[PDB]
Amino acid sequence: FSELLDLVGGLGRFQVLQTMALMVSIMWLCTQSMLENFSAAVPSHRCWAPLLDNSTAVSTSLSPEALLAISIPPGPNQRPHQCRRFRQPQWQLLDPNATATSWSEADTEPCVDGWVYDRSIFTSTIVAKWNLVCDSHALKPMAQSIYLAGILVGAAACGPASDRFGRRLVLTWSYLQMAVMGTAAAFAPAFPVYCLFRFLLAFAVAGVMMNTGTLLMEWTAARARPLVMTLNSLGFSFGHGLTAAVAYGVRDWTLLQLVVSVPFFLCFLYSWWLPESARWLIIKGKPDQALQELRKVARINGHKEAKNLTIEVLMSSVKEEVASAKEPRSVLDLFCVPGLRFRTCISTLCWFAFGFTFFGLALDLQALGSNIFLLQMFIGVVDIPAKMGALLLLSHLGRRPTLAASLLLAGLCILANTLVPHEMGALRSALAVLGLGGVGAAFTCITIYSSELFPTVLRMTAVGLGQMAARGGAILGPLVRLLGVHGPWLPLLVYGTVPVLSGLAALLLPETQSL
Ligand SMILES: *[C@@H]1O[C@H](CO)[C@@H](O)[C@H](O)[C@H]1NC(C)=O
Numbered sequence: 001f002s003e004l005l006d007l008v009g010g011l012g013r014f015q016v017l018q019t020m021a022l023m024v025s026i027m028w029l030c031t032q033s034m035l036e037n038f039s040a041a042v043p044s045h046r047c048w049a050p051l052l053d054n055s056t057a058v059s060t061s062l063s064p065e066a067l068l069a070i071s072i073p074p075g076p077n078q079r080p081h082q083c084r085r086f087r088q089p090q091w092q093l094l095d096p097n098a099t100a101t102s103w104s105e106a107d108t109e110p111c112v113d114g115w116v117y118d119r120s121i122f123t124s125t126i127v128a129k130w131n132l133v134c135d136s137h138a139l140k141p142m143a144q145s146i147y148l149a150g151i152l153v154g155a156a157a158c159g160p161a162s163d164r165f166g167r168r169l170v171l172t173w174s175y176l177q178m179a180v181m182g183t184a185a186a187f188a189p190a191f192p193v194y195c196l197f198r199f200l201l202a203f204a205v206a207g208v209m210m211n212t213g214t215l216l217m218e219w220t221a222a223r224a225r226p227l228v229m230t231l232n233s234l235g236f237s238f239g240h241g242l243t244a245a246v247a248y249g250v251r252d253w254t255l256l257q258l259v260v261s262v263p264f265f266l267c268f269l270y271s272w273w274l275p276e277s278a279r280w281l282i283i284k285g286k287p288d289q290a291l292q293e294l295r296k297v298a299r300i301n302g303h304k305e306a307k308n309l310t311i312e313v314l315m316s317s318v319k320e321e322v323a324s325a326k327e328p329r330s331v332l333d334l335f336c337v338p339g340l341r342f343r344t345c346i347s348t349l350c351w352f353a354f355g356f357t358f359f360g361l362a363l364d365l366q367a368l369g370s371n372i373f374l375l376q377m378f379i380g381v382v383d384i385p386a387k388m389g390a391l392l393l394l395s396h397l398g399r400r401p402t403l404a405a406s407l408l409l410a411g412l413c414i415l416a417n418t419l420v421p422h423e424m425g426a427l428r429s430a431l432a433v434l435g436l437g438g439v440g441a442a443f444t445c446i447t448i449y450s451s452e453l454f455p456t457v458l459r460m461t462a463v464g465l466g467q468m469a470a471r472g473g474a475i476l477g478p479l480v481r482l483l484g485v486h487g488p489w490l491p492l493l494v495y496g497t498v499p500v501l502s503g504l505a506a507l508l509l510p511e512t513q514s515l
């Protein structure tokens with residue numbers, strides 16, 4: 001096939017502009033996923049209480065600190081209880097002779113009158129709007145799980161639709177669905193409706209993710225294809241910085257969600273000026289359309305050959321593909337072949353670990369460091385050099401040691417985060433950033449390495465199964481935080497154990513760089 005790209009220009013003005021255009025979309029698409037660090041931030045809260053909040057009642061000369069001690073009991077964390085209040089004001093607790101033994105839990109009641117939230121950092125969040133606290137506290141990670149499950153279902157449905165209707169058409173309606181569903185989520189009236197719209201937004205996120213990469217690869221000559229995949233992967237790196245930059249300015253969740261959604265109307269509008277994949281149009285037996293959209297690109301790249309492209313040349317240049325690209329093999333074949341079964345197991349585990357660890361940690365920055373805006377920005381800034389170093393070492397040291405070393409870097413940093421005491425917040429934050437950097441490097445590493453461990457007929461099958469495994473791991477990511485009742489160390493130990501085991505496992509793979 002690529003002989004045609006050499007008539008049309010296989011790297012040039014069109015591929016440059018297409019890479020820029022799709023990278024920008026991937027940036028905003030990354031903001032959509034990272035948003036719920038900020039849209040769903042948990043502000044500090046307490047029960048509403050008469051002496052503190054009933055401004056219509058008779059006031060007193062006591063200070064707010066004293067009235068808080070008189071109204072809200074202390075909780076386990078040596079801070080005011082987030083889910084209880086005194087049944088009657090505890091005037092007895094003001095005198096210096098008082099002790100903690102002076103009251104008992106029967107003297108307290110739950111927040112009958114609802115909660116009061118700290119508005120200093122964020123003006124509003126979904127947690128503050130729908131009271132996703134105390135007995136409802138599980139509902140935040142449930143919302144994140146529903147989003148990531150939406151992406152799983154969307155990726156499962158994308159394949160058949162992408163193959164039947166085309167890369168660009170599905171990408172176009174994915175952009176429209178992202179805009180519409182993000183705008184709808186921004187104005188949802190109730191929590192179930194918000195979950196429905198976030199699910200339907202994720203369903204389109206999957207389509208954008210898959211089709212952008214597929215279309216970039218299908219329009220790029222082979223010498224530049226790894227570089228193009230790397231640039232498309234740096235799109236997310238800049239997406240992290242963009243998330244921090246936008247969320248630092250917009251402190252209301254409705255306005256923030258709307259702001260990050262609206263750009264996709266423009267993405268929808270400019271996607272119509274992209275060409276549908278020529279490989280797809282030829283494979284589906286539509287030469288008259290493939291010729292048009294090839295010489296359209298030849299016009300952009302500035303070639304005289306737009307006069308030379310002709311149907312007979314177009315047909316003669318792709319004689320093999322239409323005659324042989326007819327093997328949509330089932331996933332089970334990977335397990336049927338004795339040799340490939342165990343390689344498939346290990347590579348699928350390496351895909352799983354990325355999603356599990358990354359969307360375990362990256363979606364609760366509030367636990368990792370002092371300032372989530374700056375920490376998100378750093379998760380971008382450190383992701384970039386990690387990815388470039390991954391590409392280079394992947395090109396020199398071999399895929400096996402680079403995959404193993406990246407995953408072991410991630411695991412060791414995330415585990416060490418549990419050894420460093422809570423007082424050393426700076427080192428905890430730095431280790432968390434480095435761990436997410438290692439995971440993000442392994443993302444590129446595995447994307448390329450899994451495309452070599454299997455014979456060329458089953459290469460694509462392995463990559464698809466790996467992607468589904470990463471999505472299954474991402475879904476479990478958020479739910480693992482529900483173990484945190486037993487301690488803050490436990491979710492971190494789990495998230496750190498997974499990459500350690502998978503990184504050790506990657507050592508058992510064969511090397512695929514030339515030896
Ligand atoms: C708040 O104060 C007003 C003052 O008139 C009173 O009528 C009302 O019952 C009070 N409510 C609570 C919950 O203290």
Ligand SMILES: O=c1[nH]c(=O)c2[nH]c(=O)[nH]c2[nH]1
Pocket residue numbers: 030033236237383440443
């Ligand atoms: O390096 C990444 N950063 C992300 O924020 C992200 N989100 C995603 O779905 N895949 C990736 N990869």
